[PDB]
Amino acid sequence: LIGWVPHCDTLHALIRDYREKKKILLNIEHRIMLRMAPDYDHLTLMQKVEVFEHAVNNTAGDDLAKLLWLKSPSSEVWFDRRTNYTRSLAVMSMVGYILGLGDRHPSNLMLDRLSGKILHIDFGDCFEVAMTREKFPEKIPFRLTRMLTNAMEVTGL
Amino acid sequence: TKHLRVLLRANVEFFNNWGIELLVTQLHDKNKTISSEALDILDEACEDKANLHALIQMKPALSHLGDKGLLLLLRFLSIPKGFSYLNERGYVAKQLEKWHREYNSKYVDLIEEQLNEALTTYRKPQRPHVYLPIHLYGQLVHHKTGCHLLEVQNIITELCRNVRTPDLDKWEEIKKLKASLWALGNIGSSNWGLNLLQEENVIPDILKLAKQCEVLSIRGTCVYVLGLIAKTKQGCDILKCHNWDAVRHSRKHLWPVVPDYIGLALPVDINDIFQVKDIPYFQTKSFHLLRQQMSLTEIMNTGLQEHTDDNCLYCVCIEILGFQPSNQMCRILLRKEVLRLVINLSSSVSTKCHETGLLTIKEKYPQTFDDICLYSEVSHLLSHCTFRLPCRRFIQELFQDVQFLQMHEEAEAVLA
Amino acid sequence: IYPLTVASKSTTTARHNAANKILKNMCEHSNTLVQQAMMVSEELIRVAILWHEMWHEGLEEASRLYFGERNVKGMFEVLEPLHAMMERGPQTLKETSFNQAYGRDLMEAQEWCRKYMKSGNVKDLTQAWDLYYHVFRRISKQLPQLTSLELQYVSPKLLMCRDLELAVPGTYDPNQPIIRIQSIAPSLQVITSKQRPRKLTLMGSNGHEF
Amino acid sequence: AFLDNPTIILAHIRQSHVTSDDTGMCEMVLIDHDV
Amino acid sequence: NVPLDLTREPSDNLREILQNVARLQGVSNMRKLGHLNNFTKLLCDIGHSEEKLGFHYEDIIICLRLALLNEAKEVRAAGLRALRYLIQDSSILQKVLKLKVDYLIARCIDIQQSNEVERTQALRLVRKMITVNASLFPSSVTNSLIAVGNDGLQERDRMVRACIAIICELALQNPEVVALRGGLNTILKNVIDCQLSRINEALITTILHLLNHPKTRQYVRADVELERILAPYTDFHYRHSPDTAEGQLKEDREARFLASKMGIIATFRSWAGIINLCKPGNSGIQSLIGVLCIPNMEIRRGLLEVLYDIFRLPLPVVTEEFIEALLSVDPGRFQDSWRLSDGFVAAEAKTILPHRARSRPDLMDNYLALILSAFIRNGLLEGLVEVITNSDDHISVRATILLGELLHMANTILPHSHSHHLHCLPTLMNMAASFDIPKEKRLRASAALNCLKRFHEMKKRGPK
Ligand SMILES: [Zn+2]
C-alpha cells in the first residue's frame, strides 16, 4: 500500500503534453536515428555514437526549460521553483549513487508542480544490479541528460 | 358458434333453455372444427348446475365423438338424476373396466399434453389457462351412491399399495406411479371421497414422497395432486396438521376476506422440498525425454508404443482372417519422431512449430506415411486424447494419398 | 499491529506460530483492535489481486517452467495454492461468478494432473494443459476491460464498517493525537498499466480524505 | 412441464432441429427411416 | 453397371467383392460405384445370413473396409451406405467393431473436402449404430463428434447442428462414454451461443434429464455444470470464445444475453431445474438475485426482462413516466385480433369477460405459486425495493410495475400464511418515513408508494 503524493506528475507525461500542444511529435529524436540507420540496435559502439550525436544536434533540447516557465504565474514564483528544482535533483543524484539506484527512466521521475521538487519512485534496482545485467547494462551513475541540464540555469551545471 | 360463448359469459337471461338446445344441433355439424368448437364452449357451460341439468334431460349422443366427447359425457355421473339414467343400460360398469386397463395411464398424458403446450414450446402434432380434465374417479365420489360402486370394486387398496412400494428404476413403471397419484388426488376432492381415503392412511405417504423422493419429476407431481386434496374445508385441515398450508377461498370473488375452494397447497417452509441428497461424482471413484537434448540428424549420425494385436487395422486379421505378417533401424527412429509431434500437438500451446515439423518429414521422407500400423497407432491416439478441429483435420489428411498394398494383397487372397 | 499481521500470514511455519503467540498476548488488554486488523488485512489483499488475476499470473509462470525449464515437480507446486483456494468456497459474488464461468474447466484439469501422478503417461499431462491454456486465453481477453471495481461486487465486508478504531496506515506518531479510519469509499479506480494498481481512498476521523 | 420420459424427449430433439434449421441438413440426416 | 440377378447368390456375391480391392489396377472407380449399388439391391432380396449370401460376415466387412480409403467421394459415400443396410443386429455390429472399422468411419466425418453428400451418409450410419446397441458405441466416433461440435462454429462448418442432435440422443442411452470425452460440456457451451428458441429448449432438456433420475446425477457436477448458463448475467465481463473478431464485440454481448435468457427461462419451467437452482445451500438463484442489487445499468435492464418472462407478464413500454407505462399493461388494451376482419366479438370477449369456472383447479396457478414462493424466500422483494430507489428513471418504472404485479398476484394465489406479512413492505416503508436519510432518496421511496397505489386501482377496475 503506497501513499499517493498530490500535486505531482511524471516527467514523461509532462513533456508529452507540451509537445502535442506545440504540434511536435513525441518521438522526433527516435525517428531521426532510425531514418539515418534503421539497424540502430545492431550498430557497434563507435557507430552508435555517430547516430546518437547527430540526433541531438539537429533537435534543440529545451522543452523542460520552457515548460517550467509557462506554468509559473509570475517571475518571482518562477525563480523560486527553479532554485528548488536544481538543488533537489542534485541531492538525489548523490544519494542515489551511493544506494546504487538504477532504471531511472522518465516514468519513474516525478516533478512537483507547486514547489518544483523532484521525487523518485520504484526503488526496485539497487546496489548496482542494473549495471551487471547481461541485457542492456546501463553504465551511468545517475540520470543527467541534456533536457535536465538545460532547465536548471542558463550557465549550466 | 364462437359467438355463443360471449352470450354464455354475459349471463343472458334463460340461457339454459334456448342456448343449450342450439349447441346440440350445432354439435352434429358437417365440419369437424365447428363441432370441435361447440364442445369447447359446451364444457364451460356445464360448470353451472342449471345448465348441466338441461343436457341430462336432453340425453344427447356423444359416443360418436372423440375423447373430448367422452370426457364431457362422464360429467353426467356427478348428478344423481343423470347417474340413474346412465347406470341403467350397463354403462358405468363398462367404464370402470376401461378406466383400469386401457387409458387409466393416458389420463397422465392428457395432463402432460396440456402443460407441455401451455409453457414448453413443444407443439405436439399471453398467459393461457390449464384446467384439470374430467376424471372418472373424481366425478363418481360426488354422491354416496356413486361412491358405493368405487368401494365394492376395491380399487383404493390396489392404488395405495402402488404408492407405499414404488419402483423408481424403469421408466415404464414410473408412469404407473403417476397414473396412481393422479387417481388418488381426484378421489380426495370431495368430503365423501375422503372418508374412504384417509381410513387407509395414504395422505401422509404422499406427503413423505413429496419431500423425500429420488426422482425429481415424482416430487413435483405430488405438489399438483396435493392441491386437489385441498378443495374442501375438511381436506385443508388434514394438510395443516402436517405443516402444509392451502388457500381457503373460491375464485368467484377476487378479494378474499378471512372470516368450493380452488386446488392449491404449499408447504409452510418452501425449503422442505428443494433438498436433494448428494451423490459423489463418478470420476472420483523414452524417446520423448531424449529428443529435447539432441537433434533429428544428430541421432542418425517396435517404434509403436501402444501397438497390441487387438487394435490394429491389419494385425487384427492375422488370426480371424488369416493374413500374412507385415514386412519392413533408419525407419524405426522416424516413427517415434512422428508420434511425439502428435502428442505435443494435443496441447495446442505451439501449433505452428509442431505442424511445421510434420510437413518437413513428409517432404524429406514421403514414404514414412505409408504403413498401416503407424496409421492405426495414430488413429488410436486420436480417440483417447482430445484435439482441436483444425488440428484434428490436419492429421488424417497426410494419409489421403496412400495405397496400403499390404491390406489389398491379403484381402484378395483370403477372399478368393 | 501491521507488521505482526504480515508475519502471521507468512508461509513459513516458524514465523506463523511465533507471530500468533505475540498476537494472543495483545488480545488481553486490547482484543477488538487485533480483530479489526485481521479483517481489514484479509480484505485489502483480496481486492489487490482477484481470482482471475492470480490464475493469469500463475498459469503464465507455470507454462514457462514446464516448456522452458522442463520441470514438472516445480509446475505443480505453483498451481497447488491456486486450486487450494477454490476448495474453500467463494466468499463474494465476484468469486462466485468466476467459479461458474471457469469452474468446470479448472476442476477437471486438476483431475487429469492427478492421473499423471499415478499413471505417469505423458498424454495425461498434455491433455491437462489443453484445459489450462484454453482458460488462460479467455482470461487474457478480459483483463484490458477491467477499469473500475465496485466494493459490493468484490468484497461486501469493506463498505459495511462505517467505523473503525484502527489507525490510518502510514500515519502514527506517539507525540500526536491518533486518527482512525472512519469509512471506505464504495468505488475504487483501476489505473491502466501492466501491474494494474488500484486507487483506494479512505476517510479519516477528522474529515480529511487519504 | 413434464419432459421426463425419453419417449417424448427423443421426439422433441428430432423435431426442433428439423423444423428450425436454416441449412437443409437436419431434414436429410434425421430421417425417421433410419430409426 | 448391369444387375444380373440371375445366377446363384454366391456367384453374384463374388463379382463386386472382387472388384472392390482390384489391387488399385485394372478397375475404374465408376464400375466400383455401380457394383456397390448392386450389393444393396442384392441384400434387399436375400435376407441377412451367412448361409445364403456366400461368405461369412467377417469376409464381407474386409472387402467393404477397402472402400472408404478410395480418393473418390462418390465411392466412399456408396461404401458407407452399404454398411448401413448390413448392420441390423448386435452380432453383426460387434463383428464390425472387432475389425476396428471405426478408425475409418470417424475418418470420413471430418475431411471437409466439399463432400457434404458423403458426410450425410456417415452421420446417418451413426444413428443406426446407436439404435442397434448404444452400449457398444466406439469411443473413436464419439471424440470426432465432440470436436466437430465443440469447435464447429469458427470454421464455418454447415453440419454443426446436425452433430449436436446426435450427441444428445447418445447422451440419453449411454451417458458414460459421453461424460468421459467431455461431451456434456459441449452441450452447455452450445446453448450460450444458440439463439433459436426451439433448439435451445431441446438442448437444455437433455441435460436436465440426466439430473432427474438418481442413477444419472453422478455424471454431472454439483455447482459448475448447470450454473454455466448464469455466467453472462453474473459476470460483468464475459468472454465465451477465446478467439473472435473485435468488430462484433458489442453485438456478441447482445447475442449472449438473448441466448442465455432463453436458457434461464427453459430451466425454470422443469422440475429437474427448479430444485437444482434453488437448493438450500449456495445456489444460482441467490447469485442471480444478489447481482440485481449491484448498481449496474446493463445487467439490471437485462434481468428485469428475464423476470417478466419467468412469471409471463406483459412488458410495459420504455418511458420515464409511470402513467404512460401504466396504460400499456391494462388488460383492456386493444389488440390486432379484435378487428372486423379477425374475430369481431368472440375473440375480444374471451380476454374481457371472465371464465365461468369457480371450482375447477387451475394447474398454471399452482406452478406460479411455487415459483413466486421460491423467489420471495430468497429475497426478491428486498432486491426490487433497492432497484426502485437506487436506479435510473427509466429502470425504476419497470421495477415498480413488476413489484405491483407480484403483490396483486400474491394476494390471490398464495396461501394466507405466506402473504400475511407481504403487503407491508418493511424496507420500502422505512425509507419513506425517515428524515435522517438524504431527501432525494426519501422522496423516491415516497413517490413509489403513490405510483404503486395507482396500480392497485387499475386491477380494481378490471377489464372494460
Ligand atoms: Zn499393426
CA distance B341 to B318: 30
Residue B177, C-beta contacts closer than 8 angstroms, at least 6 positions apart = B162, B163, B166, B168, B218
Residue in chain C lying closest to A2 (CA): C170
User: Percent helix, strand and coil across chain D, each rounded to 5?
Assistant: 60, 0, 40
List the beta strands (DSSP E) in E277-324. Answer: none
> What is the rounded radius of gyration, in angstroms, for the C-alpha atoms of chain D?
11
CA distance E394 to E66: 69
CA distance E449 to E429: 8
CA of E159 vs chain D CAs: smallest distance (Å): 7
**Among residues E103, E86, E91, E113, which one has the least CA distance to residue E138?**
E103
For A100, list phi and psi in degrees, rounded to 5.
Answer: 80, 30
CA distance E458 to E326: 8
CA distance D14 to D1: 19
Half-sphere exposure of B31 (CA within 13 A, CB side): 6
Residues of chain B neighbouring C63 (CB-CB closer than 8 A): 349
- Cell 390396489 belongs to residue: B158
Cβ separation of B343 and C122 shorter than 8 Å?
A: yes
CB D15 within 8 A of CB D28: no
> How is residue E214 written as a grid cell?
438418481
Half-sphere exposure of B49 (CA within 13 A, CB side): 5
Give residue E101 CA to ligand 1 midpoint distance, Å.
Answer: 14
**Among residues E445, E329, E319, which one has the least CA distance to residue E387?**
E445
Amino acid, single-letter form, for residue E353: L
- Angle between helices B372-384 and E139-150 in degrees, nearest 10: 60
Residues of chain E neighbouring C89 (CB-CB closer than 8 A): 282
CB C70 within 8 A of CB B292: yes
CA distance C95 to C52: 9
CA distance E323 to E316: 11
Residues of each annotated binding site of A for Mg(2+): 108, 122
Cβ separation of E279 and B275 shorter than 8 Å?
A: yes
Of C111, C123, C133, the CB nearest to B349: C133
Residue in chain B lying closest to C126 (CA): B347
Give residue B311 CA to ligand 1 midpoint distance, Å.
Answer: 8
Q: Is B345 helix (H, G, I), strand (E, B) or coil?
A: coil
Of D1, D5, D7, the CB nearest to B119: D1
Chains E and D touch (3+ CB pairs under 8 A): yes
- CB count within 10 Å of CB C161 equals 16
> How is residue E238 written as a grid cell?
464475459
CB E111 within 8 A of CB B395: no
Q: Is B137 helix (H, G, I), strand (E, B) or coil?
A: helix
The DSSP element (H or E) to which A118 belongs, if any, is strand A118-120
Q: How many B-C residue pairs are in contact by the CB < 8 A criterion?
A: 30
For C190, list phi and psi in degrees, rounded to 5.
Answer: -100, 125
**Among residues E38, E42, E4, E41, which one has the least CA distance to residue E19?**
E38
Q: Is the dihedral of CA E403, E409, E411, E416 positive or negative?
A: negative
Amino acid, single-letter form, for residue D26: C
Cβ separation of B119 and D3 shorter than 8 Å?
A: no
Q: Is E55 helix (H, G, I), strand (E, B) or coil?
A: coil
CA of C133 vs chain A CAs: smallest distance (Å): 29
Give residue E231 CA to ligand 1 midpoint distance, Å.
Answer: 48
Cβ separation of D9 and E199 shorter than 8 Å?
A: no
CA distance B196 to E37: 69
CA distance E109 to E153: 16
- Do β-strands A109-112 and A8-10 pair in parallel, antiparallel, or remain unpaired? antiparallel
The torsion region of residue E401 among left (phi > 0), alpha (psi -120 to 50) and beta comes to alpha
- Cell 450454473 belongs to residue: E227
- Cell 385441515 belongs to residue: B237
CA distance E100 to B316: 8
CA distance B413 to A32: 79
Chains C and D touch (3+ CB pairs under 8 A): no
Give residue B371 CA to ligand 1 midpoint distance, Å.
Answer: 9
CA-to-CA separations, A127 to A101, A102, A130, C104, in angstroms, rounded: 7, 8, 8, 47
Determine contact: C153 vs chain B, CB below 8 A: no
Q: Is the dihedral of CA B53, B54, B56, B61 positive or negative?
A: negative
CA distance D27 to D17: 8
Report whether C127 belongs to an annotated binding site: no
CA distance E380 to E418: 14
How many residues does this entry show for chain E? Answer: 464
Cβ separation of C130 and B381 shorter than 8 Å?
A: no
- Cell 520552457 belongs to residue: A66
CB E41 within 8 A of CB B401: no
Of D2, D7, D12, the CB nearest to B115: D2
Cβ separation of D35 and E131 shorter than 8 Å?
A: yes
CA of D7 vs chain E CAs: smallest distance (Å): 11
Cβ separation of E364 and B214 shorter than 8 Å?
A: no
**What burial class does residue B218 get, using C-beta atoms within 10 Å of its C-beta: 0-12 exposed, 13-18 middle, 19+ buried?**
buried
- Cell 507471530 belongs to residue: C19
CB E50 within 8 A of CB E57: yes
- Angle between helices B106-118 and E363-378 in degrees, nearest 10: 60
* Angle made by CA atoms B371, B374, B379, in degrees to the nearest 5: 125
Report whether B312 belongs to an annotated binding site: yes
Question: Experimental technique used?
Answer: cryo-EM
DSSP one-letter code for A3: P
- CB count within 10 Å of CB C209 equals 9
Long-range contacts from A93-101, C-beta under 8 angstroms, 24+ separation: A93/A141, A93/A142, A93/A143, A93/A144, A96/A120, A96/A142, A97/A141, A97/A142, A99/A126, A99/A127, A100/A126, A100/A127, A100/A128, A100/A129, A101/A125, A101/A126, A101/A142
- How far from chain centre, in Å, is Cα C89? 14
CA of C25 vs chain B CAs: smallest distance (Å): 44
CB B343 within 8 A of CB B302: no
Cβ separation of E415 and B275 shorter than 8 Å?
A: no
CB A140 within 8 A of CB A148: no
CA distance B157 to B164: 11
Q: Is E153 helix (H, G, I), strand (E, B) or coil?
A: coil
Chain D interface, best mutation among E118, E121, E199, by max D CB count within 10 A: E199
CA distance E458 to B336: 80
Residues of chain C neighbouring B384 (CB-CB closer than 8 A): 123
Identify the bridge partners of residue B266 per DSSP, sorted by sequence position: B245
Give residue B360 CA to ligand 1 midpoint distance, Å.
Answer: 25
CA of E222 vs chain C CAs: smallest distance (Å): 10
Burial call B287-303: b when 16+ CB within 10 Å, e when fewer? eeeebeeeeeeeeeeeb
Cβ separation of B317 and E221 shorter than 8 Å?
A: no
CA-to-CA separations, B51 to B56, B260, B267, E10, in angstroms, rounded: 9, 18, 37, 77
CA-to-CA separations, E366 to A61, D1, E233, in angstroms, rounded: 82, 12, 28
